[PDB]
Symmetry: C3
Subunit: 332 residues, 3 copies
């Protein structure tokens, strides 16, 4: 037996009306495939003589180990996209432009414009609040070594006439000077001043000073000769006063120096000394003393003498002469 | 020949004891599948007559191109999760709340509380350190155009009596005034002062001033009439002094003006002029000069005259009279 | 019929020259596989009698649902890597080191070194610019409650002699004192001063003051007795002046107090009172008044008397005596 089977091309079977007997094999000549009869179905309705089911295969690949598009996408959706997020480098680049609380260097202007909760009161208020209670350094240190400039080191301005606080308030306890102004010996000379004050206020002193010294002056002024030359400073003074009219005024009636004691003092109201020796003084009652010969380009009105060293008046002289003239003419 | 084969249902083969001859075909009537004999195995132990090995298939899918769960997970593990990381927008939102070193606007309080390395000394110390050496602007510019307020523009306070530094130190070189206080002509008038100083310190002057002017006063004061009216300021003064007791004190012995030269000066100790003409002065030795008629409501003690223009004393008058009385009575 | 087929091992077929007839089955005894003849090809060139094409299988897996390495990699490439990006925690850790514009606490030094656009001029310049126009708090509040320190609360320094701005400028409008210095009654006593000024400048006053008061002094000084003891302050003064030579100088010619009116005043140039009663004064023309007995340790040069209360001169006395001597001797 060399057995051969009913056979033709797949497409010819496809339209054959031949019914294979149950288990009778038929052959597709162009595919090599067989199919077996069931006794009723046409060829195209028979299945192949061997399984075609993925689940019966051997050497299957690991389908279950492979990632699904859905599950991968869900996992990607939790991850941050490059474009919506700064790198470490761009983060640091941005942060290096900001000021550390530990400290840093400003190259531009720091403005304050408080919104003002209340901005407090005392040692806990202010837009800038500096507490040096636990440290030995300075608070605010401003300086310039520039040759010239357009602005002061520090400027304080108030714009409204009702303003009811000070520009600068110094409340000081300690053992040196609350406020100290040193104007160092000039090389190129200024025609100006350590401290300069002008007021146009007619209802208040330009400067007020109250002190309560046991044995010093409330204000102490010392002039020191700038030169070793004994008389170089001959036009200088410890205190100089001028009294002037208003530009285009008719003049002035202001006094130079006015001294009073509202409670009454027993001290000398004006005491002038040289080398610590009294030279001239006005006592608390208005009597004066002068150490040396003095001059008046005028007369002197005073009372009649009662002691030998009293200056005589014209009355006293005239009377003593008139007495002598009478007696001497003789008396009956 | 129409060949048919030993046949029955798969499940019936499954328990048949029939041994197919080597290569003899048997048919599963309900599956369509054949199996071929090996001459020993029961039907259920024969394999199908055609391969069932994934590796022999054609049109395989690209299994190797597909991603594995393991390898995807490893790759996801290097990526940043959305939730642990700021977006660019939230980054910028946070950074815009911080101050740029280039500059910016504070809306709240900046406090300093130095921890203090040493906080240095001189032109490199301070919690706030401003160096204007290479620029032409101002250092610290504080101002207010508010009508009223509860606090000063600037406040300096020291709390302990041992405190051994100044509240404010000005070390100045330059060509204008180190410190300048302008109190602008008021519209609504203050009863106060450009500069006001009080000290309760009995061992130190409230204010100390030293200068070394060639031809000016160490302190120069000018009063200017506030009005064009010649005598409007008739109660005004360039300098006014008061001398008062302590509240509930018995009084005071303090002097008004005390002038000394500890090294000895040849200048006039008190010089009073009007329109630049000497009117009254006290010389370095205590002699005074007065330009016009003067009055004492009292006597004047002085020495006996020796020149024609010297004031005479009662002694001198009495003696000259007593001489004339004698001579004239005549002498034996 | 029990049909058997041409058969041998796969490897033996592999080199057989037997040609199966068209559809004649041949069997591989070691694999179980059949192949069918085409009438020309050797065994090894026939295909199996049943399909081996993945596309004809049933129960296929969802290959299309699975993610490709390429497509996953493209998706991963858009995601940010953990290592190149800050977590929220490290972001906040960095940001907490920076200063909020809302406010914050500096623990280190804030330096300014302006690059200077121009740094402006007026109420819009300065490295630190504080505008309190809409608020009621203080501007700059510096204080210390430390026992001692190495630096001042505030320090202003200019290094070059040409410097042509002020260290401190106060431009004040308002109703209290522009600048106020309180030196609180000491418990441990300082030998120093509320305000201390030194100048080595020979071409400018150490301090300049101009005021235009209707009825006050430009400078007002009050000394108050520190004690209830009436004469405790007997060495004190409201104003004290000293006039000294330069260290290693030959001396000085400086004046003590110099008073002038450059425009001419009709006021009293020096007025001394006690309990508000005139005790001594120098009029605008140089005439003086003294309330009580006075003394000169010297002579007084003055003009010849013309009124009864005028002091007499030696000339006047000598002449009146010489007249009496003549008349009395009698006249022919
Ligand atoms: O910071 C600017 C404010 O200026 C205020 O106006 C006055 C100021 O009060 C006065 O002293 C002087 O400086 O002139 C100013 C106007 O030129 C304004 O009223 C206020 O609105 C601000 O512009
Ligand atoms: O006070 C404001 C102005 O002060 C001027 O200085 C003048 C001063 O006003 C004047 O009275 C006299 O003493 O000369 C002073 C110069 O030493 C400033 O020059 C000017 O800028 C204003 O700030
Ligand atoms: O510029 C004011 C200074 O004037 C000096 O007075 C000169 C005065 O100008 C001159 O006429 C002459 O009399 O010598 C005076 C000094 O002895 C003041 O001395 C000086 O202190 C300034 O006030
Ligand atoms: O910043 C507050 C500090 O105050 C210090 O106490 C004193 C201060 O020295 C004195 O001058 C006055 O201001 O009274 C204060 C107490 O009420 C404290 O000693 C210090 O602990 C701080 O609280
Ligand atoms: O010095 C601290 C206080 O100064 C007061 O001003 C007074 C001053 O004390 C007084 O002696 C007199 O001259 O009147 C001044 C007002 O012009 C302030 O009023 C007060 O707030 C304290 O700061
Ligand atoms: O408030 C102090 C001022 O007193 C003025 O003195 C007046 C004085 O009060 C009055 O009794 C009368 O004698 O006129 C005086 C002025 O001529 C001072 O003149 C003034 O400078 C202030 O000290
Ligand atoms: O901030 C330091 C600058 O100091 C300037 O030099 C002078 C200064 O002008 C003078 O007043 C005194 O302080 O001595 C200094 C030099 O020791 C320098 O010229 C400048 O280059 C800076 O170093
Ligand atoms: O002005 C700079 C210095 O002031 C000194 O204080 C001295 C002052 O100079 C002197 O003339 C006299 O009045 O004694 C003062 C002390 O009360 C400071 O001591 C010194 O640190 C310098 O800053
Ligand atoms: O240290 C300067 C103070 O001197 C006081 O003068 C004393 C003086 O030293 C003494 O010789 C004696 O005459 O008593 C004087 C006071 O009556 C000043 O009184 C004082 O104001 C300071 O200048």
């Amino acid at each position: 037996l060399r057995v051969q089977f009913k056979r033709m091309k797949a497409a010819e079977w496809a339209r054959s009306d031949v019914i294979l007997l149950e288990s009778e094999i038929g052959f597709e000549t162009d595919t090599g495939f067989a199919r077996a009869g069931d006794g009723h179905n046409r060829f195209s309705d028979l299945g192949y003589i061997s399984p075609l089911d993925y689940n019966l295969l051997t050497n299957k690949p690991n389908i279950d180990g492979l990632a699904t598009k859905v599950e991968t996408a869900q996992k990607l959706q939790q991850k941050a996209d490059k474009e919506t997020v700064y790198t470490k480098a761009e983060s640091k680049q941005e942060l290096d432009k900001k000021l550390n609380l530990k400290g840093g260097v400003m190259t531009g202007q720091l403005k304050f414009k408080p919104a003002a909760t209340v901005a407090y009161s005392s040692s806990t208020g202010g837009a800038v609040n500096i507490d040096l209670s636990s440290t030995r350094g300075a608070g605010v240190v401003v300086y310039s070594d520039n040759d010239t400039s357009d602005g002061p080191l520090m400027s304080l301005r108030t714009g409204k006439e009702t303003f009811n606080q000070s520009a600068l308030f110094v409340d000081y306890k300690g053992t040196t000077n609350a406020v100290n102004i040193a104007m160092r010996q000039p090389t190129t000379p200024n025609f100006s001043s350590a401290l300069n004050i002008t007021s146009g206020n007619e209802n208040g002193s330009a400067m007020q000073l109250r002190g309560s010294e046991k044995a010093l002056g409330t204000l102490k002024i010392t002039h020191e000769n700038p030169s070793i030359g004994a008389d170089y400073d001959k036009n200088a003074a410890a205190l100089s006063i001028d009294i002037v009219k208003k530009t285009n005024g008719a003049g002035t009636a202001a006094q130079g120096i006015y001294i009073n004691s509202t409670s009454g003092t027993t001290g000398k109201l004006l005491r002038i000394r040289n080398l610590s020796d009294d030279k001239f003084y006005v006592k608390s009652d208005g009597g004066f003393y002068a150490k040396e010969t003095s001059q008046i380009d005028g007369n002197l009105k005073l009372k009649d003498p009662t002691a030998n060293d009293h200056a005589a008046t014209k009355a006293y002289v005239d009377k003593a002469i008139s007495e002598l003239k009478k007696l001497i003419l003789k008396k009956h």
